[PDB]
Design a protein around this ligand. Structure first.
Ligand SMILES: OC[C@H]1O[C@@H](O[C@H]2[C@@H](OC[C@H]3O[C@@H](O[C@H]4[C@H](O)[C@@H](O)[C@H](O[C@H]5[C@H](O)[C@@H](O)[C@H](O)O[C@@H]5CO)O[C@@H]4CO[C@H]4OC[C@@H](O)[C@H](O)[C@H]4O[C@@H]4O[C@H](CO)[C@H](O)[C@H](O)[C@H]4O)[C@H](O)[C@@H](O)[C@@H]3O[C@@H]3O[C@H](CO[C@H]4OC[C@@H](O)[C@H](O)[C@H]4O)[C@@H](O)[C@H](O)[C@H]3O)OC[C@@H](O)[C@@H]2O)[C@H](O)[C@@H](O)[C@H]1O
Ligand SMILES: OC[C@H]1O[C@@H](O[C@H]2[C@@H](OC[C@H]3O[C@@H](O[C@H]4[C@H](O)[C@@H](O)[C@H](O)O[C@@H]4CO)[C@H](O)[C@@H](O)[C@@H]3O[C@@H]3O[C@H](CO[C@H]4OC[C@@H](O)[C@H](O)[C@H]4O)[C@@H](O[C@@H]4O[C@H](CO)[C@@H](O)[C@H](O)[C@H]4O)[C@H](O)[C@H]3O)OC[C@@H](O)[C@@H]2O)[C@H](O)[C@@H](O)[C@H]1O
Ligand code: BR
Ligand code: K
Ligand code: K
Length: 731
C-alpha cells in the first residue's frame, strides 16, 4: 500500500547554479527559475519562497530535471513551457521533451523530442532557447543542440517539428576533441527573440531574431514570420551570442557575446547594438574585445522595460577579484560599473550585500585577502534580469545562489544598491552522504560544492559549512555508533582530497594526514568505539587503516581501491567492504580483510549498511535491470546473505526507529516493490513494505544518500541529486 507522509526540504537555501531567471512580461511578481539538475521553480510572493514544479519527474525519466529553457507567456500568464533533458552524450539515455502547462506549472503535459536536450551540458547559460510569439501565442520556437537546428510548434507546444528553412544548426563545441565525450557537443541554436511590433494581436509576428553558436554566423533574422531566414548583414564575427534582447521602443537588438559557450569560462567578447530601421551595427561594449584590458566575455544582458534606455550586462567570466556588472542609462552610449579600482588592491563599490539569511555564502571566510571580498558578488552570472514591472528590482543567478536588489535605481542617483539572497525554497544541492546520530543534532549533510552542514534545526539555514578542513564537497561522513560525538568526514578540496576528524560532534574539527595518491574524498568508515578509521580515497591504489585517528595510515592488502567500506555498529572489531560482486569482512579492526561472498550478489551493487544495535546484521542493495537486482540481508557478519523475495529492485537501504511494539528498526529503501518504483518502509523486517512517497514526489535520480532517524519513528532523510536534502514524516 501507501501511507500519507509530509515531505519537506532540510533548510539550506540554494547551493547550486541557476542558469536562468525568467520574468513574465505582463504580470507583476510572476517569476520562474530554471536549474540544470533540479527542475524548475515558480516564485510565490505571498510566502517569499520558490515552489518546485518538476518533483514528479521520476526514476525512468530522471533527465527531465534538466531544464534547458523556460518560457512564460506574456499573452496568457497561465501558460508556461520548459525544454527538458539533462545530457546530450551517453549519460542521459533519454531524449529531451517540451513540457507545456496552462496552470503556471502546477500540472504539465509532455511532448518528447526526437533528440537530446542538454540541461546540464556546456552552453546551458545561453538562452532562452524557447520563445513564444507575443502576438500569436500558439506559436513557440525552440533552439536545439546537436545540429537539430531550430524547431517550432504552432499548437501551444503540443506538436513540434523542425523548421527546415533554418539551415544553420551551429558548429561550435567547447572542446571538439574531448576524449570524455562531455565538452564535444554542438551547442547549436541558442536563443530566439521576437520583435513585438512586427505583428498585432492574433497575428503572426513577422520579425524574429535567432542566435546561433557559430562564430562566423551568429545572428539570423526572418522578416516573413519564419518562412525564410537570413544571416544578418554586417554583423560582427569571432564570438558566440549568449543573449539577444530586443527593444521595440527604440527598435534595437542588443547582443552579448563571448568567446566560449560558458558557463565556467569566457576570456573575450563584445556587446553590440543592431538598429533595425537602418541596419546599423554599433559596438557598445563597456570594454571592447580589441582592448587588452578585457579579460572576459559578456552575458547577463537585460533591458529595463519600464525605462528602455537602461540596460545592464555582466562579465562572463571574471573570477578575480569578482564579477563585474555594468549599467548604462543611455542605450549603451556609456556605462558605469558596479565596482572600481581605487589604489590596488582597494576598490570602491556601488553595492552592499547582506547574507544574514544565508550566512554560509561567506564560504567559511568572511575576510579573504584584498582584493577579494566574501561574500563575493558572484560567478557564472549568466542570468541577470531587471524586473519588467519594477525598475528597482533585479535578480541574478550565480554558481551558488540567486541575489536580488529592490533598490536598483539608487545606482543612478550615486547611491549603493543592497543585494541579498532570494533562494528560500530553491533547494538545489546534490547530497552525497547523510547521517542521523542518536544524540545531538538531528542530521549532518555531506554535500556537493558547499561542503555540508550540521543541521541543528531543520527549518533554519546553518551558519557555516564544515571547516578546518573546509571541503568543496564532502563525499562521505560517519560517526562512532557507541560514541557519536566522534565523527569523520572525507572530501575534496583545492588540489585533491582530505579527512576531517572530531570528538565533539563537530564543535571543532581538525584535518588529518593523507595516505598516498589521494585525488578525491572517496568513502570512509569509523569503528563503533571510534578507535579505527578505514578510508578508501579517490585516486589512491589501496584502502587504508588509521589506528591513530587520522595521523598515520597503512595500506590494507586484500581490498580493491574504491571499495565501499562500512563499520559494524556494535563491534568495533568488525568492518566490511563491498566491491564489484565481492563482499569482504575484517574481524581485526580493519588490519586485514578476506572475501566472504563472491557470487550471488550483483556486481553493480554498491550500497550496504550495518544496523545499529545489531552486531553483524547487514543489508545490501543494488543491481541493474539487465543483470540481477534486489535487497539482501546478512545476519552473520557478512558470511552469507539472503535475497529478500519481497523486493524486486533496490538501490539503497537504511534504518530508523522501530514502530511501537515492533522488535526491529524500521527499514527504508529506494527501490521497486510489487511493480511500483518509489520509496518504501518496512516495519516487519522486510516481510512487507509501504510506499511513503507518491507520483508528485519522486525527485528523479534520488537516493544516493539516505538515513533513517534512530530517534523519530517514520522519519526518512532523503538525499537527492539537485533537490537538496528532504525529510519525510508519517502524517
Ligand atoms: O566566496 C567564494 C569562495 O569560493 C571558494 O571556492 C568555492 C566556489 O568556487 C567557485 C568556483 O571556483 C572555481 O575555481 C576558480 C578559481 O576560484 C579561480 O581563481 C580561477 O581563476 C582563474 C581562471 O582559472 C583562469 O582561467 C583565468 O584566466 O584567471 C583566473 C584568475 O586567476 O578560476 C577557477 C575556475 O577555473 C577553471 O574554470 C574555467 C577555465 O577557464 C579554467 O581553465 C579552469 O581552471 C582550471 O581548473 C582545473 C580543475 O577544474 C585546475 O584547478 C587547473 O589548474 C585550472 O587552471 C572552481 O573551478 C569551480 O568548480 C567553482 O564553481 C563551482 O563548480 C561546481 C562544479 O564543479 C566541477 O566542474 C568544474 C571544475 O572546475 C571543478 O573542478 C569540478 O568539481 C558547480 O556545480 C558550482 O555551481 C560552482 O559554483 O564555490 C564552490 C566551492 O566548492 C568552492 O570551494 C574559494 O575557496 C574561496 O577562497 C572563495 O573564493
Ligand atoms: O568528462 C566529464 C567531466 O565532468 C566535469 O564536471 C562537469 C559535469 O559534472 C557532471 C555532474 O554534474 C553534477 O551537477 C552539478 C551541476 O553541473 C552544476 O552546475 C551545479 O551547480 O552543481 C551540480 C552538483 O555538483 C551532478 O550532480 C552529477 O550527478 C553529474 O555527474 C554525472 O552524473 C551522470 C548521471 O549519473 C547520475 O544520474 C543518473 C544515475 O543513474 C547515476 O547513478 C548518477 O550518478 C553520470 O553519468 C552516468 O555515468 C555512469 C558511469 O560512467 C553510467 O553508468 C551511467 O549510465 C551515466 O548515467 C556521470 O558519470 C557523472 O559525471 O557536468 C556538469 C558540469 O557543471 C561539470 O563542470 C568534471 O569537472 C571533469 O573533471 C570530468 O569529470
Ligand atoms: Br578572471
Ligand atoms: K528568448
Ligand atoms: K576570464
Amino acid at each position: 500500500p501507501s501511507e500519507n507522509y509530509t515531505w519537506k526540504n532540510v533548510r539550506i537555501d540554494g547551493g547550486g547554479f541557476v542558469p536562468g531567471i525568467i520574468f513574465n512580461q505582463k504580470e507583476a511578481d510572476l517569476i520562474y527559475a530554471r536549474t540544470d539538475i533540479g527542475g524548475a521553480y515558480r516564485w510565490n510572493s505571498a510566502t517569499s519562497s520558490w515552489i518546485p514544479l518538476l518533483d514528479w519527474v521520476g526514476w525512468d525519466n530522471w533527465g527531465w530535471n534538466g531544464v534547458m529553457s523556460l518560457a512564460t507567456d506574456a499573452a496568457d500568464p497561465n501558460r508556461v513551457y520548459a525544454a527538458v533533458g539533462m545530457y546530450t552524450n551517453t549519460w542521459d539515455p533519454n531524449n529531451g521533451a517540451i513540457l507545456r502547462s496552462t496552470d503556471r506549472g502546477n500540472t504539465w503535459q509532455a511532448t518528447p523530442l526526437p533528440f537530446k536536450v542538454g540541461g546540464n551540458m556546456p552552453g546551458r547559460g545561453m538562452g532562452e532557447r524557447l520563445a513564444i510569439d507575443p502576438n500569436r501565442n500558439s506559436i513557440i520556437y525552440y533552439g536545439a543542440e546537436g545540429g537539430n537546428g531550430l524547431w517550432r510548434s504552432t499548437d501551444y507546444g503540443a506538436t513540434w517539428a523542425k523548421v527546415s528553412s533554418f539551415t544553420n544548426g551551429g558548429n561550435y563545441a567547447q572542446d571538439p576533441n574531448d576524449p570524455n565525450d562531455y565538452l564535444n557537443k554542438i551547442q547549436g541554436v541558442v536563443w530566439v527573440t521576437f520583435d513585438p511590433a512586427s505583428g498585432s494581436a492574433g497575428n503572426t509576428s513577422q520579425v524574429i531574431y535567432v542566435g546561433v553558436a557559430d562564430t562566423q554566423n551568429a545572428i539570423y533574422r526572418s522578416t516573413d514570420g519564419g518562412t525564410t531566414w537570413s544571416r544578418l548583414a554586417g554583423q560582427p564575427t569571432g564570438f558566440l551570442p549568449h543573449k539577444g534582447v530586443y527593444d521595440a521602443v527604440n527598435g534595437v537588438l542588443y547582443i552579448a557575446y563571448s568567446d566560449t559557450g560558458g558557463p565556467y569560462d569566457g576570456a573575450k567578447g563584445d556587446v553590440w547594438k543592431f538598429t533595425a530601421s537602418s541596419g546599423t551595427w554599433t559596438n557598445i561594449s563597456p570594454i571592447p574585445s580589441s582592448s587588452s584590458d578585457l579579460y572576459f566575455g559578456y552575458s547577463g544582458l537585460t533591458i529595463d522595460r519600464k525605462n528602455p534606455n537602461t540596460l545592464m550586462v555582466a562579465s562572463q567570466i571574471a573570477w578575480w577579484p569578482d564579477a563585474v556588472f555594468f549599467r548604462s542609462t543611455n542605450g549603451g552610449a556609456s556605462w558605469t560599473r558596479i565596482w572600481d579600482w581605487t589604489s590596488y588592491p582597494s576598490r570602491s563599490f556601488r553595492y552592499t550585500m547582506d547574507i544574514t539569511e544565508v550566512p554560509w555564502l561567506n564560504f567559511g571566510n568572511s575576510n579573504p585577502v584584498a582584493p577579494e571580498v566574501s561574500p563575493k558578488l558572484g560567478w557564472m552570472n549568466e542570468s541577470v534580469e531587471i524586473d519588467p514591472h519594477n525598475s528597482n528590482r533585479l535578480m541574478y543567478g550565480t554558481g551558488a545562489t540567486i541575489y536580488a536588489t529592490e533598490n536598483l535605481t539608487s545606482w543612478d542617483s550615486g547611491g549603493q544598491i543592497l543585494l541579498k539572497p532570494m533562494v528560500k525554497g530553491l533547494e538545489e544541492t546534490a547530497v552525497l552522504d547523510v547521517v542521523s546520530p542518536p544524540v545531538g543534532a538531528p542530521v549532518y549533510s555531506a554535500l556537493g560544492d558547499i561542503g555540508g552542514f550540521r543541521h541543528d534545526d531543520l527549518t533554519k539555514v546553518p551558519t557555516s559549512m564544515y571547516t578546518t578542513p573546509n571541503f568543496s564537497s564532502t563525499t562521505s561522513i560517519d560517526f562512532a555508533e557507541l560514541q557519536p560525538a566522534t565523527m569523520v568526514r572525507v572530501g575534496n578540496l583545492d588540489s585533491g582530497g582530505g579527512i576531517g576528524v572530531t570528538t565533539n560532534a563537530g564543535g571543532s574539527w581538525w584535518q588529518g594526514q593523507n595516505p598516498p595518491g589521494v585525488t578525491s574524498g572517496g568513502n570512509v568508515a569509523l569503528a563503533a568505539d571510534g578507535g579505527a578509521i578505514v578510508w578508501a580515497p579517490g585516486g589512491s591504489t589501496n584502502v587504508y587503516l588509521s589506528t591513530t585517528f587520522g595521523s598515520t595510515w597503512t595500506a590494507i592488502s586484500a581490498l580493491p581501491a574504491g571499495a565501499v567500506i562500512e563499520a559494524d555498529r556494535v563491534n568495533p572489531n568488525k568492518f566490511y567492504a563491498l566491491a564489484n560482486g565481492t563482499f569482504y569482512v575484517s574481524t581485526n579492526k580493519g588490519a586485514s580483510f578476506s572475501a566472504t561472498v563472491t557470487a550471488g550478489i550483483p556486481a553493480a551493487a554498491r550500497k550496504f549498511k550495518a544496523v545499529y544495535g545489531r552486531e553483524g546484521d547487514i543489508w545490501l542493495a543494488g543491481g541493474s535491470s539487465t543483470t540481477t537486482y534486489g535487497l539482501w540481508r546478512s545476519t552473520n557478519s557478512g558470511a552469507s546473505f539472503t535475497k529478500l523475495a519481497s523486493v524486486q529492485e533496490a538501490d539503497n537501504v537504511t534504518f530508523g526507529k522501530a514502530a511501537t511494539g515492533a522488535t526491529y528498526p524500521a527499514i527504508y529503501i529506494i527501490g521497486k516493490v510489487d511493480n511500483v518504483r518509489g520509496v518504501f518502509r518496512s516495519t516487519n523486517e522486510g516481510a512487507s513494505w509501504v510506499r511513503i512517497n507518491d507520483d508528485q514526489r519522486q525527485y528523479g535520480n534520488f537516493g544516493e544518500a539516505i538515513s533513517g532517524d534512530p530517534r523519530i519513528y517514520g522519519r526518512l532523510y532523503l538525499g537527492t541529486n539537485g533537490r537538496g536534502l528532504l525529510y519525510g514524516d508519517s502524517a
